[PDB]
Amino acid sequence: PIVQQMVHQAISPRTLNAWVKVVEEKAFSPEVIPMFSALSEGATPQDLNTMLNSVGGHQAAMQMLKETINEEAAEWDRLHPVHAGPIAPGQMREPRGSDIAGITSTLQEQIGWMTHNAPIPVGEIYKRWIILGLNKIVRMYSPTSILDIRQGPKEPFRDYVDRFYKTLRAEQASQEVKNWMTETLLVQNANPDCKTILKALGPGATLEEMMTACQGV
Amino acid sequence: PIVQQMVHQAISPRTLNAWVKVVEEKAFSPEVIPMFSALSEGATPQDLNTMLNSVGGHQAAMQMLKETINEEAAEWDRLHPVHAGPIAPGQMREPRGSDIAGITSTLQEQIGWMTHNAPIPVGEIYKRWIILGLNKIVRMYSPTSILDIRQGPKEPFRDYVDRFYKTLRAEQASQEVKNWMTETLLVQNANPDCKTILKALGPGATLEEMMTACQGV
Amino acid sequence: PIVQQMVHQAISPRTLNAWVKVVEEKAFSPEVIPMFSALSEGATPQDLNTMLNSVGGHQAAMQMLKETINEEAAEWDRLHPVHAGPIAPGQMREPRGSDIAGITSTLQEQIGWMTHNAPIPVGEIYKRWIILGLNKIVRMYSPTSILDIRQGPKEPFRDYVDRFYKTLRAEQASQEVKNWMTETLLVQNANPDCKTILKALGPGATLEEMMTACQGV
Amino acid sequence: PIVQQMVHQAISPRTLNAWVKVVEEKAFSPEVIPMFSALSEGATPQDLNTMLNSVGGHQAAMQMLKETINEEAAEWDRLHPVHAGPIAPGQMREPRGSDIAGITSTLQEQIGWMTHNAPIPVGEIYKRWIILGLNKIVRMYSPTSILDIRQGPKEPFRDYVDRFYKTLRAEQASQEVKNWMTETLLVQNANPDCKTILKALGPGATLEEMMTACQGV
Amino acid sequence: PIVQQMVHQAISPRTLNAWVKVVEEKAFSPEVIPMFSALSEGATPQDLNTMLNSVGGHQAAMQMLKETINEEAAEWDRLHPVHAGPIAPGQMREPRGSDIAGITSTLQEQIGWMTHNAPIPVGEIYKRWIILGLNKIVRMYSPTSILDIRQGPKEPFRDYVDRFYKTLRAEQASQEVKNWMTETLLVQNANPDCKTILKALGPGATLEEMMTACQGV
Amino acid sequence: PIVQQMVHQAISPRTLNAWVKVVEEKAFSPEVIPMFSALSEGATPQDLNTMLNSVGGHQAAMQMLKETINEEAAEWDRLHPVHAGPIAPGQMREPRGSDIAGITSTLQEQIGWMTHNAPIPVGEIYKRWIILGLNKIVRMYSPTSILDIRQGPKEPFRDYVDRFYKTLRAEQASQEVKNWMTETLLVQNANPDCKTILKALGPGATLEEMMTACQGV
């Protein structure tokens, strides 16, 4: 990574090992995406490729990630056309999509783009593309849909809310659609007892009020 | 985090892993709140969101935390109205509530608000809101009330005090109300033997005197 | 903590985790007090409160510690009366007892008192009070008294000395009283064989001479 | 290693231990090669030889690695003929192939070549040769060929893709040949149900479309 | 500790934990003394007392260590008489024996004696006394004497040499006496087969020659 | 150790613990020698003696190591005769053999010889002697000879090569003799099937060609 006088560091064994263990244990659970970002703070494309390629197994998801990264690289290419000509002594060459992904750019070039003034944060751009692919994978590997989360007859409300917001965290929808799902399905798909209790509260009750209301049930 | 010449560091694997393990092991026990603060010392909103989002499961509590943070952000908004206009070259833009929570503010902007003179410690404000939500969760997940802690007939006084001050630590009440609870319930709800022994001591005996008095019982 | 150009650091996960594990494993054994001090070297009151509050369970002892700290704070208050008036631009405000314990003083104020010339080491004062309370707890949780340590008929002398100086380490008495206890009880409460062997040595034999004399027995 | 003011560090116990454990656990799986590179970032030839020689067992593969490194060293020799003569006071001696591999060059000489201006990155050259040998080993120890990966009658498509791209990751072929293998064999060697489903999609469907199409099957 | 611009550091959790585990696992085996020294490199008397007092159990040995340290302190006192008078502004006070052992000297005073020019390395003096006591303990807790190590009839020579030099490492004797013990007892107390084989070699054979000679036996 | 502005550090707990565990687990396997060197990079004689003396058990091998180091010290003595006279203010005293081994030289003197211009790297000289003794031990504790490694009738070629180059790694012979052993015994001592297959390849086939040729067998 690069940390602040900015200097370049090699990726630590604790970081890489921690990421490998995260993929081994949690597979592709939503919390993997924050952890990944946390473990890639200030990373060069070389460090990002290091983290991705250090994963054994799950090669279907890693190939999908490759294809997503390729799409984003092509979009960057058509959106940023490269200008032909010799680079000046005090200038950097324009990065291609494959240069953002650390495929066709050396570590020195990445340090150059990231640190030198008028910069291009290639590491955070690549990280953005990676996170897009990771969210697509998280969608694909979520078994349940939010529309099928229903409270059991004897299920405590709290556990049902845990399931609901886990599945909702796995759903691929904008925050307004998520807001609608909380607005409708949560109270809609509760068992009749808690459903009546919550319906009596009014359409503007917080989750704390709702959980306190049905905690005895 | 940011540590003192102030410099910005990435969050360490030991810190994040330690927090994840703390939530996995202790669930939402009161001691989680100090640990959290200890693990968030000098953190930017990005690090705080990193710690919160790295938690799998307990998504009901995490959603409640989101709603609490939203309330505090709205209060900050109405209390700090944003002034329209272009920001000067040597000035920072006024942070909104969503900027305090790291939702709508970049890492660079957070470094700017935290370090630059005439500062706004957005990390400690966000941390304050988070701790409010965490205390609400700790209340909700405490099964017992302080009014029901009663010493058993053969229960040693020391264990009863452990239960009493654990449950009391989970109670949501001001320090004066807590002082009243220690003043009344502790001696009130002991078994008749220790109750008589303590009643003989006088209304101004320390906990050490009380525990030494009933340690034989 | 603060370490030497003096700079302020956040408390490390290894330190806090190590302390939590120390309390979990050793409960309130005497060696906990050195370890604590070792883990609090150069700590601010915020770090000390962090270590104390990160302890789950043992809430009777933690409450006793709170009461001891309150007593010491009151003594500091009556011994150091606060002078009313506005603080000068280049001066610190006088710390109250609650400011020493990190209850009513910010981290910035603690850094100020500890680092600025003509200093007040509030961290080491608070640490002193904490250690007083910890010694009181160690007394209360010691089951045996030094007067009851007696060598068994077939017990090797070495194990009896281990028990004797463990219990003695738990005793609350000045070093002169401890010197008297070593002078009298150790030889007094040995089994008749080793008791005769030691009595033949003279009143001025070292522990090495005494243990070598009875190692065959 | 050497990290950026560039300074020379000794190899850390976490790095060497991590590499030894990687070879012990994963044998010669493809992900070993990225990890190795990650653990050798900025390494001198002494550190590379340290990592290679610290491996017990697998001595057939380590000998093959030695022979590959010898071939690359001979090629460097014939491609870079050494010029006879005394080295100037402010100049470095021309490195031989055995000097790149850390066999006949001191640590001081390696620091000299790597740091001094007009440099020769001997560590990354040696690392390149090592990675060539490692890829040859990875080929030799891959049991299956890509031409034999066939979906089972009841095998979910996702697992079949995992096998396919694992074996493909082990294959020694250019990226164009790999592109042809994905273009032909993946759809070719699926079971008739998924084979028909995929054939209906068209010759230009992404892996995400293909996996979503057959996830019910 | 203090490490080189010399600066004072707090003792690390890895060091203290490592020492505690060393005493827990190895009790008082000879290798404990090097480890201790390694873990106390550049330590102040506060760090040394920290390591010693962090040991639970073995309180007989720790008390013996206290008595040894007291003897050495008294010898330092009579050998270095303190001169009465006020200390100059740029001078240190003369350290007493109790000041060397960190009993009656603050951390600041220890830093002063150790760092300031014309220094007194109180940490290494205290460490020397501690190591004297530790060697006395190692003698006391060694069960066997070197005079009783005898090779079994079917015991391989190598194991007998392991026992011999372990027990010899535990013996309290000068290096000339140890040289005599190797010169006499090793060949003297071997079984008749190896005894004849070694006697044929001559009085000037190395341990390698001796072990190679009897490795078939 | 000493690391580059050169500064002296204390040996880390991870390094010493790692070495102790290496000896405990691998005994005296060849890979111990690289690891040792890796863990002693930039070490003073005090650190080397620290690593050697921290080893419990294996005291026959450690005594042999002592005797080897003594031989090398005597050779250094006769090869470097000490010149009598007083040392100048800006000069170092000539190191004896016992000074190289950290027996009769303080840490300060070792820092002096290693850092001061016109230096004598006493740490790397001592390390060289130690490695000589370690190689002698590795020879003595290798049970098999290279002349007895023979492929089984049903043994895969790859495992036989593993045994062959392990035993060969344990052999004490120059690289030309090793080259002859690979040239003759490897093909000589294979089973008749693989022996014929390899004999058909020609006297100039690489190990990769040989292993690929017999991998079906």
Ligand SMILES: [Cl-]
């Ligand atoms: Cl995995």
Ligand SMILES: [Cl-]
């Ligand atoms: Cl998954």
Ligand SMILES: [Cl-]
């Ligand atoms: Cl790869």
Ligand SMILES: [Cl-]
């Ligand atoms: Cl651009």
Ligand SMILES: [Cl-]
């Ligand atoms: Cl951009």
Ligand SMILES: [Cl-]
């Ligand atoms: Cl519930």
Ligand SMILES: [Cl-]
């Ligand atoms: Cl969890």
Ligand SMILES: [Cl-]
């Ligand atoms: Cl909970």
Ligand SMILES: [Cl-]
């Ligand atoms: Cl998230």
Ligand SMILES: [Cl-]
């Ligand atoms: Cl503001």
Ligand SMILES: [Cl-]
């Ligand atoms: Cl504010």
Ligand SMILES: [Cl-]
């Ligand atoms: Cl009790």
Ligand SMILES: [Cl-]
């Ligand atoms: Cl606990």
Ligand SMILES: [Cl-]
């Ligand atoms: Cl206890």
Ligand SMILES: [Cl-]
């Ligand atoms: Cl608290």
Ligand SMILES: [Cl-]
């Ligand atoms: Cl004051």
